Every structure is written in structure tokens, then in C-alpha cells.
From a paper:
The myosin motor domain consists of four subdomains: the actin-binding upper and lower 50 kDa (U50 and L50) domains, which are separated by the central actin-binding cleft, the N-terminal domain, and the converter domain, containing the long α-helical extension known as the lever arm.
To reveal the structural mechanism by which myosin-V senses the nucleotide state of F-actin, we have solved the structure of myosin-V in the rigor state in complex with young JASP-stabilized F-actin (F-actin-JASP) to 3.2 Å (referred to as young actomyosin-V). Surprisingly, and despite having ADP-Pi bound to its active site, F-actin adopts the closed D-loop state, which is characteristic for aged ADP-bound F-actin. However, a control structure of F-actin-JASP alone (3.1 Å) confirms that actin was successfully stabilized in the desired young state, having a characteristic open D-loop conformation and ADP-Pi bound to its active site. The closed conformation may therefore be selected for its superior shape complementarity to myosin, which possibly establishes a strong binding interface between the D-loop and HLH motif and by doing so contributes to the high-binding affinity of the rigor state.
Author numbering:
A (entry chain A): 433 to 504
B (entry chain A): 649 to 792
C (entry chain A): 5 to 33, 36 to 54, 57 to 186, 190 to 216
D (entry chain B): 4 to 79, 86 to 97, 100 to 150
Amino acid sequence: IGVLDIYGFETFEINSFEQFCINYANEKLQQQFNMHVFKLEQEEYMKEQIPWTLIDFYDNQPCINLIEAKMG
Amino acid sequence: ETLNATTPHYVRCIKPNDFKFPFTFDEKRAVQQLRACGVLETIRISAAGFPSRWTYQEFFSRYRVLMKQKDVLSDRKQTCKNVLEKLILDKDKYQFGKTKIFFRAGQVAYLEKIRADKLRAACIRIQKTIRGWLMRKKYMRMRR
Amino acid sequence: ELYTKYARVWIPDPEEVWKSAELLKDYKPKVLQLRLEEGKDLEYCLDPKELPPLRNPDILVGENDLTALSYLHEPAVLHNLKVRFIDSKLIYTYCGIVLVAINPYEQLPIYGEDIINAYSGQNMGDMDPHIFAVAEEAYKQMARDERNQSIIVSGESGAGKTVSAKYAMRYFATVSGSANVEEKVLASNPIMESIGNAKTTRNDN
Amino acid sequence: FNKDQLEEFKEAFELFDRVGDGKILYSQCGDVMRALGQNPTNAEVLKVLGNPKSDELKSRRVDFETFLPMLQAVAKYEDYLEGFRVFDGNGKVMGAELRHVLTTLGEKMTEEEVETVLAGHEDSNGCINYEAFLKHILS
């Protein structure tokens, strides 16, 4: 069982390569969190006989692709 | 890769005041920390969906103040399906689960407000009736 | 519509990020007659378009879970956290599956041993929120199924992430039946602080 | 109102006249309306009075002739029963809950009025037969 101490999203009057890397890491963690919450809620909706196609999923992949993809 | 192997559980930490005071809550600093922890955006994402869930008996208990005795029925689940389907017009707002009702944001506040209005007006009517009846008796006492 | 006399709304204020108001006359489709606590009366512009955040009823206010609130917005969250923290001294709160932990600088009793045995066994909703409830939800999922479990903690380093981890590990140690992981890890903490921590404009250490 | 009713009401009015000048206060207008068989809300009383200010409500005096049109305007069961079943539908009402709601919601009354009307009507559990209590307060 593994307990992660990390830093959160960070903004200053001046932002710099350090803040840019911290924010890209936080964007990745937030993507994992959003996918996990969306999975758990899909399982709860299928459990409760609701149409699961209703639940709306919100995806920061366009930002991650902006930062990290080729010609990012 | 290390996290994807594993099922997560989350904690967020927020720093309530800038100066280490024991319980002072500074709403500016706490707002900044709640944005920096993505809690506010998580709450935005949730508010789009069905955030609020009620078990049919607990709903039935709370809104028996609204419910009429003719509506009460031998199946509470069907009773609440009927009463709710009347009370909130647009079915898009809500869904019926097996054991829980789901509501979009605000709908439980809507039910609570119509409950407070109805209960207030009924209380006004009974209160004015009792005040009149007692003071009318004091009128008859002064006549006697 | 939902706007009536004897209804409450949140108004923006630069000194405290939101201020409570009461509506003195019912709205009908460009200005509202707004009561306050800061004087009795005020006249408040609507903006070209916007209506203020409408305030949740007080059965839902102060609930152990922010998603019990019927309106969800920054004012309701900020108020509900403030009332739990200031009035009841309940530092822990829930939002979806997240546990929000608000750091008191004052020390509390609540970490004491017995509560570990009180939380243990209890399903996550059956008890009021506390860090032991997440520590159990991990330990229980580890015992129930093959998978490892992870706990992920975020915030400016003063906020007390290390204290949360320390108490999670005390929960594990006390339920599991021990030796001397905890003392060694907390002995390591000054080294990893000394070689990995830094001083930043917004924050020391 | 017929001549006889107006005469009986004027006599009653003078019985409620505690100063001898043949007049009542604005604040007494509601008292006279309820004493004469009307059951107006506080809002209706203030509306027919013209939303008077505190000072004139407590010290400005009006004779019967100006009060009368207001009494007329005020003058011109199943809902009451359902309203009572709201606060229960087994024909009972908690005494504690009815007391709390009557002293804390709506047009709040004093505890003494509620004690006076409720005296002898609650049992050991603190339950009121509300159909009988309703007939009693409407009689």
C-alpha cells in the first residue's frame, strides 16, 4: 500500500520551466483522477439500472497533447 | 506506470490561513488552495451529472409533508415515482434507479423550497385560526 | 422562478470572496432589492448575462459530503467548509471519492488510538469522514482483492501531507499487528527534507 | 352587516376601548376583526390597515366608522384538515412538534396562546386528535 506525497498545481506572478513541469505533472495526475472517477461512476450507474450513456466524461487530453506531443 | 498498476485513493490538503493561526479560516487563501487542488473543477464536473442521490424510503419520509393520502400506496417505490413525476415536469432532470432516485443540481433544493412554502402557508393558516379563536373567546369573556 | 423575496443569494465582495444576501422583492425579468448584514439595504446591479449564486437550504449545509449540497458552486463549498471547520472543528470532509483535509495548526485528540479500532470494519459512508476511513478503504480493498492500493496526497507542502501519511501509517501498523517501519520512515523524513526541500517565494520548505 | 350586528359590534368595540374616547388603535383593528368572528392573517390586517408605521399603529386612534370598511373587506374545511395531517395521518399530532412549528414557523404565535388552546387536549404521549381540535378552534 503506497502513499504518494506530491506537490499541487502552482502559479506565481512569474512562471518558469519549474512551474511548467509541475503543471504538466499535475495535468497527468488530474487525467488519471478523472478517468478513475468516471469508471467508478459508470459502474455505479450500471449497478442502478440507469442508462450509463448519460454520464458525461471530461478529458484534458487536448492540453496534455499540447504540452507533450510531437511539436508540442 | 507505477500508479496505473494500482487503484488510487485521494487526499487533498488545504492551508486555511497564511500565518499558522490555530483555526482562522481566510476565504481568499482557501479559495486559492481549492482551485489549486482541482476540487472546484471536480465539483464543476460533478454538477453536470446527477450529483444527488436519495433512497426511496428516506425521500418518502421527507416529502410525506408534500404527499397526499390518496397518493400514498402499497408500493412506496411506485408512490414516489408517481409523486416525483408529477412534481418535476421535465424527466431529463431525474432518473429512477433500482433503489435510489437521482437528481440534477438544484432539484432537491426545489423540493425543499416548495416544502417550506407549503408548510409555512399551512402554519400561517392554523396559527391565525388559533389566535382568532382564543381572542374571540376573550371577546366573549369581556361580553360576559 | 426560483428567485423570490425571502430567498438568499451570494454576492461578490473583494474583502471576503463571497457575501450572503437576502432578496427583499421577488425577481421578475434588471436590478435586485438586496438586504445584507452590512447595513439593512442595498441596490445591486445585474450584469449583461448573470444572476447570483442561489444559496442551499440549511438542512444540506454542514453535511459531511460537499456533494450532498443541492447547489454546487464555489460559494457553497467555501461556506460549508468554513462552517464545519470553525463551528464544529471537523477538519475532514468528503467530495465525491476525494477526502478534503483542512489543516488545523492546533493539535487535536482525534488521532488517538481507540478511534482506529472504532473506524476499522466500517464501510466508508457509515462513519463521518476521517483519514482512517480512507486508510481502511485501502486496507480492505487490499485484503478483499489481489490489487495493491495507493493513496495520493496533494497540496502546498505546509498543508500537512506528511502528517496525513504518518497517521495513515499508524492506522496500518495498529490494525496489522506489529515492527519499526513508522519510526524509521519518520526518522528518514529530515534527510529527504534536507536534500529535497527548497525555499520558494510563496513558501518556505 | 345589519344594523343589529353593527350595534352589537359597536358595544363590543367599546368593551375593547380601554381609554373611553370611543376609538381603537390601528393595532387593535386586527384584534377587533378576530374578536368579531373574522380569521384574517396578520398580512391581511396590515394590508387593510395600509401598512401603518409602529408609532401610529400603537398610538394613532381611529373611530369605528373608519375601521368598518376594513372589517367588511376582511369579511369578503378539507384544506384545513389536510393542513393538520401535514403535521402528524392517524388522527394525532405530536404536542412537541406542533408547539415547535407554531412557535417557530409562519406567523409565529406565543407559547401561552398554544398552551391555552392545547390545555386538556394532549394525552400522556403528547398527542392531539386534530380533527377534534380543528372543530374546536373553528366552533
